[PDB]
Amino acid sequence: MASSLSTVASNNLMDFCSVFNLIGAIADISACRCERSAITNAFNKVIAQTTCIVPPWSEAQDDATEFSDAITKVEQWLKNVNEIEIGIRPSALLIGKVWSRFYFNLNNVADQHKTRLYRNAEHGRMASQSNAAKIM
Amino acid sequence: KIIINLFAPNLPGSTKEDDLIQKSLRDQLVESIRNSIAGRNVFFVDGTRGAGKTTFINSVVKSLNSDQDDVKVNIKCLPTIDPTKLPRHEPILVTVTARLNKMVSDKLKGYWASNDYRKQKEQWQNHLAQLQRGLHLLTDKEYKPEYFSDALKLDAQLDYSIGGQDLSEIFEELVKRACEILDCKAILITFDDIDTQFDAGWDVLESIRKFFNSRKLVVVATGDLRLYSQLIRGKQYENYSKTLLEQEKESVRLAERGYMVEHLEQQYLLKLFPVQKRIQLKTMLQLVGEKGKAGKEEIKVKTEPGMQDIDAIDVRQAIGDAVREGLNLREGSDADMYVNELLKQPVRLLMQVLQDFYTKKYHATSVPNLLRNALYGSMLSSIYRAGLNYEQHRFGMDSLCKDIFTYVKQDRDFNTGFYLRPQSESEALRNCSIYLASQVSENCQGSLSKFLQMLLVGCGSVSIFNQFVTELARAENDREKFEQLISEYVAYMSVGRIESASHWANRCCAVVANSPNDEKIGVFLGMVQLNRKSRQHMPGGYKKFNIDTENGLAKAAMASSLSTVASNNLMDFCSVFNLIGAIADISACRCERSAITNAFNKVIAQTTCIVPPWSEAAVRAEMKGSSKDATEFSDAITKVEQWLKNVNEIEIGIRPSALLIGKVWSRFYFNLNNVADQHKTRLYRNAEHGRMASQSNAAKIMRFNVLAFLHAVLVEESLYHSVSDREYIGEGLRLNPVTSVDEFEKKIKIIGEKLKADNKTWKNTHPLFFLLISCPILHPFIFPVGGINCSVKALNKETSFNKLIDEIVGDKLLSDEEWDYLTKQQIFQNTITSLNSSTIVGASYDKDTPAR
Amino acid sequence: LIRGKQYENYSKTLLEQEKESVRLAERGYMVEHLEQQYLLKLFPVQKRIQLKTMLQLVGEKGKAGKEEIKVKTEPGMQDIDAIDVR
Amino acid sequence: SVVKSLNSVNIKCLPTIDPTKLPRHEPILVTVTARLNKMVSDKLKGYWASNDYRKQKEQWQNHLAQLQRGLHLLTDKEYK
RNA sequence: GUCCAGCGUCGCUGGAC
């Protein structure tokens, strides 16, 4: 959840939960395996260390080993990545097509959920009711 | 294997030594020429990024002078130094005959008289006189009828197959005759750059494809294809009929003519310089490879005189030790970014940098001062071109702040441009980034006040300008308004002058207060606008500030943190940036007790600063005019005197870096935004005395403002600081203390436990945090009267926080009776007893605390 | 002076034909780069010496001055009573 | 002032020249060669010791003739 | 506390007792 938080400062701080951040964290973590502290610097790389301004064109429990298991699994995952990814042959077309489907899919989801919030969407079971967890 | 000895016996420039760097490429190209010679033989060597193309070519020329097939080589002919009206056919012809004439004159030594000696010499003279007659048809402008007789005139010898003059054939026989005389296989010609004289290329391009097309000739030309492409395209428009150009210009034929001319040049380049023959010079990064990869051949560098080759260290490690020590950086990823960028530089330049560093360092038995001196003598052109300061002397705090702000302005990066990172599209700017970063670590090394000046003046001015001033006139709309606004800003903040740190703090208060929030409430980025005049109806204990209410040391804190601005009505402010100005001024004393009373009295005063010119109330503010304890301060002077004893012993050994100061501000600046935003609406009507996280007042806002500064110092110093080779925060999420103190004390507890395990004291691992936490000025701000929560869930956190602070400093700041009053007539000498009761302008005390 | 000698190298018929704003920028940089390589090669940076203006020598307001300059306003003035230039 | 300090490791200072107060079409190389000629001729005539100014003078005069022969390259509007 | 006045577009500020 920390990897999916972003703050934008425009007359009021705003908080979003972006899927784009997860792709960033996955891209950031798998950069290297040289150091163990790298895969914990990525979680808190941007969470509370910088602020972004509105673009100009706008019209207006020991608390020290909490990440001993999450780091451990991620560390073991990088072992698999370092071996499988050698035999990867991406193309200029493969990347183009995955974004076309991914972009179209997101735009449909954001439209069929703006009206399915209601009042009792918590514990959402029926497909006609949605909350901030189904959307993400 | 490749070994470079920096301590060469004669100490030559660039330390060429032996084998150069492209020995693999040189032997590869020479092997390629021998294959072809055993129609088109044009080799293009691309010398760019200011490479030593001429040095490489001369290495090839020298190498061919000892050859198995002994293809002799002419001398290099620069086209920009020949006479303008002399055709490029002549220099080769003169070079050929001069080279040939020496050998036949040298045949006398071998043979005083011989049959071939007498026949070859007279045969050669016949060929040259043959060429001179036909040379007339090169620069002539009108065909006189006399030359017709010569064309029909026939020579029974020399075997001229094609009839007529045919100057191409006449040169071919001369070259063929010369090769047999000298006993070679081919004659090689080298063409140098054309950069100085742009137009010299055309008379060379039309000479390669006209007279140099032969089986026994090979050419090697250098330069860049940007000029050649523009040269060919220019000559392809001059054969269009001049009249047609003004007639058929109906916006359709323009496209047709443009499309056709780009077609003719494309087929032209591929005809002369084939793709298969073009060669490119490898850079240092591509030759040693990325770290962790074997890559191409490895290189070793010597570092001390009389150093055994068995101990020579790798070139990547040789630079890595220079940057990390010189820039005061750890072994993290950022330091690897500087070396990777520095590897891409030309070899001849890089070896000059390394030689000027290791030689002086060895002779010194202040590393950053050594590194900066090395870069000045190597990248002096880029420093001058970018516009920064370039005087050999007169280095200090005055110029560094100006250089930083005149670098981000050209980089157009006001967000994160003060980290001084080499990411830029200009080679001049990328060369200036490393030089600027080195200068920062040299200036603010071993001192505390210089560090605080860099945090405020160097980085605060950039961030303040971006958020507030920039919005008035964007750079993309216009350039005269943007450039005008910059010069007014730098004069206002007095960057370069830097009369005092507290002088800067007052101005920064004026700029921030210029743009108000939409709710009209007197809280800002790092300040709260305290009222000056008593209002009408205060529902509770609210009243005027009444600075006289404070005791001996609380008054010293308030007077140090009070500054006023005159815009339309005299405004009073209390800014955390004033406290940093107070610490920066005091810490640079280095004086005895006598001067402390003088300096301490100068810090505390009343200062009024005028509004910046770019505001709408400059004229009214100037028109209205700017107008309207010594016994008890001995204890305050006594405390700061003991603190300054610690500062002098401790600060000698701290190593700030250009990144640590940048990182500290980013965390500090962001935290200031959160506390201003998340306390703006919780004023209420009965919120005095605090005692609840929901209700906040003036005292709570300031306590979390000063605390945020200390918290950012703690976190960003453990992660990034040279004096340690690890970190002690641990594997955990790092947040900020925006509304409760539990986050700040949590990292203190974690660090404390780890340090005892390794038996390391705070004075060796966190010198900065220890110096700032034991500051007598800001102790009363940590525990104000009205800014302490008293909930049963959180009071244990605060009580644990108090004990930890005492242990770090070493003395019990607060007595047991004093603490009891804080959580429930007592006179406090080290606690602000009045600030919680003050009123905030623009705050209407309606409604109440939220229910439940 | 140098930039003027550079534009005389481009074929005139080309300058008057490709008058696009995108092309003007491309030829604008190739000249502002070509002159600097000419100057940085002909007058090396480490050898240039810049003269001093009056403000540098005298100083700003009460700031100490690098040198001392005094002037005389009358033929009868004495060299021991010449006032400062400021 | 710089020239005066140098004039009064040996460096012989040539008289200062300014291209603006010169004939329009006269090349710089001709002016510099003219000023070199005056010093060496003055030095040779004032020298007047032994016969050194009989061997040296011939060598110096030979080089001037060589420079005079190749001067036509500077002031040619076309190749001959 | 109360009275007078001044700046901004109700808020701010000066002064008097």
Nearest CA in chain C to B262: C18
Question: Among residues B103, B794, B840, which one has the least CA distance to residue B535?
Answer: B840
> Taking CB atoms and an 8 Å cutoff, what residues of chain B touch D77?
85
Degrees to nearest 5, angle at CA B544 with B539 and B545: 130
Q: Can you give the length of chain B in residues? A: 852
Sign of CA pseudo-dihedral C77, C81, D1, D7: positive
Edge-to-edge strand order for the sheet containing B570-575?
A: B527-528, B570-575, B562-566, B608-610
Paired tokens of B221: 């030309």
Sign of CA pseudo-dihedral D21, D25, D27, D32: negative
Query: B99: which residues sit within 8 A by CB, 6+ positions away?
Result: B72, B74, B182
Question: Among residues B321, B315, B266, which one has the least CA distance to residue B291?
Answer: B315
Nucleotide nearest to B520 (CA to C1'): E11
Paired tokens of B822: 């804080």
Contact A65 B731 (CB under 8 A): yes
B474 and chain A: CB distance < 8 Å anywhere?
yes
The dihedrals phi and psi of D79, each to the nearest 5 degrees, come to -85, 140
Paired tokens of B230: 């523009």
SS (H, E, C) chain A: CHHHCEEEECCCEEEECCHHHHHHHHHHHCCCCCCCCHHHHCCCCCCCCCCEECCCCCCCCCCCCCCCCHHHHHHHHHHHHHHHHHHCCCCCCHHHHHHHHHHHHHHHHCCCCCCCCCCCCCCCCCCCCCCHHHHC
Place of tokens 């203006």: C53
The span from the first CA to the last CA of chain A, in angstroms, equals: 11
- Radius of gyration over every alpha carbon of chain B, rounded to an integer in angstroms: 39
- The CA distance from B235 to the nearest CA of chain C, in Å, is 7
Nearest CA in chain B to D74: B83
Element (H, E) at C23: helix C21-42
Q: Is the C-beta atom of B602 closer than 7 angstroms to strand E?
A: no
Q: Is the C-beta atom of B346 closer than 7 angstroms to strand E?
A: no
Tell me, in Å, how far CA of B851 is from C1' of E10? 30
Round to whole Å and give the CA distance between B141 and A115. Answer: 85
Q: Is the C-beta atom of B249 closer than 7 angstroms to strand E?
A: no
Degrees to nearest 5, angle at CA B118 with B116 and B121: 95
- Radius of gyration over every alpha carbon of chain C, rounded to an integer in angstroms: 25
What are the helix (H) ranges across B302-426? Answer: 315-326, 333-343, 347-363, 367-376, 380-386, 397-411
CB B6 within 8 A of CB B306: no
- What DSSP state is assigned to residue B593? H
CB C31 within 8 A of CB C59: no
Nearest CA in chain A to B331: A35
CB B436 within 8 A of CB B420: yes
Question: Among residues B4, B721, B657, B723, which one has the least CA distance to residue B318?
Answer: B4
Nucleotide nearest to B620 (CA to C1'): E7
Tell me, in Å, how far CA of B624 is from C1' of E16? 21
CA–CA distances in Å: residue B289 to residues B116, B296, B322 = 57, 6, 19
> DSSP labels for B389-422?
---SS--SHHHHHHHHHHHHHHHT--SSGGG--S
Round to whole Å and give the CA distance between B41 and B87. Answer: 22
Is residue B385 helix, strand or coil?
A: helix
B518 and chain A: CB distance < 8 Å anywhere?
yes
What are the helix (H) ranges across B38-88? Answer: 53-64
Chains A and D touch (3+ CB pairs under 8 A): no
The dihedrals phi and psi of C46, each to the nearest 5 degrees, come to -70, -10
CB B612 within 8 A of CB B567: no
Nucleotide nearest to B617 (CA to C1'): E8
Q: Is the C-beta atom of B532 closer than 7 angstroms to strand E?
A: yes
A58 and chain B: CB distance < 8 Å anywhere?
no
Choose from C6, C12, C16, C17 for mutation: most chain B CBs within 10 A: C17
The dihedrals phi and psi of C48, each to the nearest 5 degrees, come to -70, 140
Which of D73, D76, D79 lies closest to B87 in CB terms? D79
Q: Which segments of B436-585 are extended strands (E)?
A: 527-528, 562-566, 570-575
Round to whole Å and give the CA distance between A135 and B146. Answer: 94
Question: Please, what's the largest Cα pairwise distance for chain B?
Answer: 132
CA–CA distances in Å: residue C64 to residues B682, C54, C72 = 54, 13, 22
Paired tokens of A98: 């995955």
CB C3 within 8 A of CB C35: yes
Tell me, in Å, how far CA of B837 is from C1' of E3? 27
Which amino acid type is present at position D68?
Q
What are the helix (H) ranges across B736-794? Answer: 742-758, 762-765, 767-773, 779-782
Looking at the DSSP assignment, which residues form a beta bridge with residue B219? Answer: B42, B189
> Taking CB atoms and an 8 Å cutoff, what residues of chain B touch D72?
none
Tell me, in Å, how far CA of B517 is from C1' of E12? 16
> Taking CB atoms and an 8 Å cutoff, what residues of chain B touch C38?
196
Q: Is the C-beta atom of B531 closer than 7 angstroms to strand E?
A: yes
How many other CB atoms are found less than 10 A from the CB of residue D64? 13
CB B274 within 8 A of CB B42: yes
Contact D76 B87 (CB under 8 A): no
Task: Among all protein residues, pick the one whose CA is nearest to the C1' atom of E2.
Answer: B536
Q: For strand E, which residues in window 791-850 of chain B come within 7 Å by CB? A: 841-842, 844
Checking C8-15 for CB contacts under 8 A at 24+ apart, the result is C9/B197, C9/B198, C9/B199, C10/B198, C10/B230, C10/B234, C11/B234, C11/B235, C11/B237, C11/B238, C13/B234, C13/B237, C13/B238, C13/B240, C13/B245, C14/B233, C14/B234, C14/B237
Question: What angle do the packed helices D52-69 and D28-47 form, to 10 degrees?
Answer: 170
Round to whole Å and give the CA distance between B493 and B461. Answer: 8
B246 burial (CB, 10 Å; 0-12 / 13-18 / 19+) is exposed
Task: Among all protein residues, pick the one whose CA is nearest to the C1' atom of E14.
Answer: B628
Is residue B189 helix, strand or coil?
A: strand
Paired tokens of B262: 């780009």
Round to whole Å and give the CA distance between B694 and B679. Answer: 9
- The CA distance from C21 to the nearest CA of chain B, in Å, is 15
- β-strand pairing of A6-9 with A52-53: parallel
Give me the torsion for CA of B161, B163, B167, B168, rounded to 10°. -40
Contact residues, chain B to chain C, C-beta under 8 Å: 195-199, 226-227, 230, 233-235, 237-238, 240, 245, 257-258, 377, 380-381, 384-385, 390
Say how far residue B268 (Cα) sits from the centre of its chain.
41
B687 burial (CB, 10 Å; 0-12 / 13-18 / 19+) is buried
Round to whole Å and give the CA distance between B201 and B187. Answer: 21
Neighbours of chain A (3+ CB pairs under 8 A): B
Sign of CA pseudo-dihedral B328, B333, B334, B338: positive
Paired tokens of B283: 């850079």
Which of B292, B667, B731 lies closest to A68 in CB terms? B731
Question: Please, what's the largest Cα pairwise distance for chain A?
Answer: 50
Round to whole Å and give the CA distance between B803 and B810. Answer: 10
Q: Is the C-beta atom of B534 closer than 7 angstroms to strand E?
A: yes
Task: Among all protein residues, pick the one whose CA is nearest to the C1' atom of E11.
Answer: B842
C41 burial (CB, 10 Å; 0-12 / 13-18 / 19+) is exposed
Q: Which nucleotides in chain E lie less than 7 Å from some protein C-beta?
A: 1-2, 6-8, 11-15
Round to whole Å and give the CA distance between B351 and B318. Answer: 11
B340 and chain A: CB distance < 8 Å anywhere?
no
Nucleotide nearest to B567 (CA to C1'): E7
Is residue B168 helix, strand or coil?
A: helix
Round to whole Å and give the CA distance between B344 and B351. Answer: 12
Q: Is the C-beta atom of B627 closer than 7 angstroms to strand E?
A: no
Sign of CA pseudo-dihedral C6, C10, C16, C20: negative
> Taking CB atoms and an 8 Å cutoff, what residues of chain C touch B241?
none
Query: B586: which residues sit within 8 A by CB, 6+ positions away?
Result: B449, B599, B600, B603, B640, B644, B777
The span from the first CA to the last CA of chain D, in angstroms, equals: 46
**How many helices (H) does chain B have, and how many strands (E)?**
35, 11
Place of tokens 């001024």: B585
The B residues from 748 to 807 touching A (CB cutoff 8 Å) are 750, 753
B467 and chain A: CB distance < 8 Å anywhere?
yes
Choose from B232, B237, B262 for mutation: most chain C CBs within 10 A: B237
Round to whole Å and give the CA distance between B201 and B182. Answer: 30
Question: Among residues B238, A90, B283, which one has the least CA distance to residue C16?
Answer: B238
CA–CA distances in Å: residue B580 to residues B399, B402, B719, B813, B835 = 21, 20, 23, 21, 19
Place of tokens 């703090």: B505
Round to whole Å and give the CA distance between A134 and A113. Answer: 9
CB B694 within 8 A of CB B759: no
The dihedrals phi and psi of B23, each to the nearest 5 degrees, come to -65, -35
Nucleotide nearest to B529 (CA to C1'): E12
**How many helices (H) does chain D have, and how many strands (E)?**
3, 0
